[PDB]
Amino acid sequence: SGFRKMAFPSGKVEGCMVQVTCGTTTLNGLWLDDVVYCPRHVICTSEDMLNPNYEDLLIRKSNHNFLVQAGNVQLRVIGHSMQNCVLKLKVDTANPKTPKYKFVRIQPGQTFSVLACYNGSPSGVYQCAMRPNFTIKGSFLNGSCGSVGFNIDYDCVSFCYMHHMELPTGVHAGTDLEGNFYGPFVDRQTAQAAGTDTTITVNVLAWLYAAVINGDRWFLNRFTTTLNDFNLVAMKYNYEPLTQDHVDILGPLSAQTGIVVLDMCASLKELLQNGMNGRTILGSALLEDEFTPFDVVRQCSGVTFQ
Amino acid sequence: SGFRKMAFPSGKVEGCMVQVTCGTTTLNGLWLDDVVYCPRHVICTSEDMLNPNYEDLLIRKSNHNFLVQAGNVQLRVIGHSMQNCVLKLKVDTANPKTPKYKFVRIQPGQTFSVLACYNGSPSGVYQCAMRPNFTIKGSFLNGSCGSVGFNIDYDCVSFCYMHHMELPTGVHAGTDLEGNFYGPFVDRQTAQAAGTDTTITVNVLAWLYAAVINGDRWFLNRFTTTLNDFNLVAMKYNYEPLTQDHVDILGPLSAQTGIVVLDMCASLKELLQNGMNGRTILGSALLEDEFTPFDVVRQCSGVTFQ
């Protein structure tokens, strides 16, 4: 019993993190087999980041300008290439600690764990969510670029995110491991508008189910609602519209707790309209939206990995 | 920038977790050199846990009743012994993945990371704090006993906690790795009163400093206070009394932000007396007390390990 914002065991990913240095810029890279992945702005200086011609900047470099550090191992660089916004450095040694992995482009509202790294050394591990506006609300100090987000399914690591940028608003943007940014952001130091961020409604509902499972009882009322009627209250408070697909996502949690999904929607409607009156739900005074329904089922069942 | 409840990289500890089976009970053990550490109630059945004579139960066992599983490695057990509330199983093979480690008895208000495990397989990683009443508010489903809490200082793992028990109130109790319980709890299935839990005042203040560092501005007022006058408001709201030692703990954070510690105390006094008016502080609508001042300095400086 009890419910925590729990991140994946980062051991599999710790063994892949390296240090990539190009000229006078040092960030993190990811070492999978004989390829190192890292943000392409490692080739930029501070002045370059305002309007960088990444192609032109890359011709000025050859393989021997990239110094890759895995602890104290020297990786020789035998080839380099740009794929969208990431660099792929061919190294002559396959990583002996490479786990089975996938590259996955995640959808908004999904969650993943972040291994914050600096100079190739792991610092901390925390969970976050891909906000509906494709940003993430993490902790990324100077030198954290190249840190990766991931999920684990038993023995396989699913890499979904690599950090690139701190927006001038304080939120964080990055790419998948094919180099494509999530959202409209570009690896350039300019004004970048982040769209309106809505609350992930299906995640809040799943977190309400985890509270009922763990004894938080007080917010279930005697009301019910319809999909279109709850969706009316949704846009009022900038919540994501609930679809039938979201209802079926919550199917298993509805089965165990015996509370119909639309009845849980009525409890959410009353929480949005009436506030929380100073009470808490799983140690929280807000409505939490960083738990996917798959996250709730995992913690409430003891699913492990390896 | 940004501030997260961040746990240590659990790779060093993942390589020490094993599965310990005695009769029909299966929990987790910790494999350091040629010794496996695990809770002593692995030798109990469900009926035994109400009034177990652990000594008498241990004579009925010999070395070949303990089946230790590290992934698919079979560890032979060549000796067993009780130290307080933990079992020490001598195995004939030293763990090749043993990091440098210490056993540490932590003080209340300190924080550590928890690697939740089931049947010897890591499930998740999260940070928590030793509450002033020596409980912890974690997530421990059935089969999580033996999971350990730890801190990392560069290359050395400081083991401080191993989980033993879920109280009938839903909170969690356990021991240090010498087998001594934190608090008055006993590995027995009975009514166990948990004392009044106060809020860790020095941790809330340090979390207020991290908010100022990261732009949360609104709660700093034009008031100041004294130690005894703030301590008056402390016991009203069940906060820990602040001592001069706590003030000096916050010294470095007072130096960087330029806000005197007692001025931050005045801001806390106004937050306790006036509520929060519906605003947030680092994405939180309550006053967070699970961040030690050493935790704040780490995240705000980029301290890494290995």
Residue numbers in the entry:
A (entry chain A), B (entry chain A): 1 to 306
Article sentences:
SARS-CoV-2 Mpro is a cysteine protease that forms a dimer composed of two protomers. Each protomer comprises the chymotrypsin and 3C-like peptidase domains I and II (residues 10–99 and 100–182, respectively), with the active site consisting of a Cys145-His41 catalytic dyad located in the cleft between the two antiparallel-β-barrel domains.
Crystal structures of 11 Mpro mutants provided structural insight into their altered functionality. We employed crystallographic structural analysis together with a high fidelity FRET activity assay by our group to assess the functional and structural changes in Mpro mutants. The crystal structures of several variants revealed the changes in side chains orientations of residues in the active site comprising substrate binding pockets, especially S2 and S4, which might lead to altered amino acids preferences. Accordingly, changes in KM values for most of variants were observed, indicating alterations in a mode of substrate binding. We observe the highest level of conformational plasticity around the S2′ and S3′ binding pockets with N142 and S46 being the most flexible residues within the structures we solved.
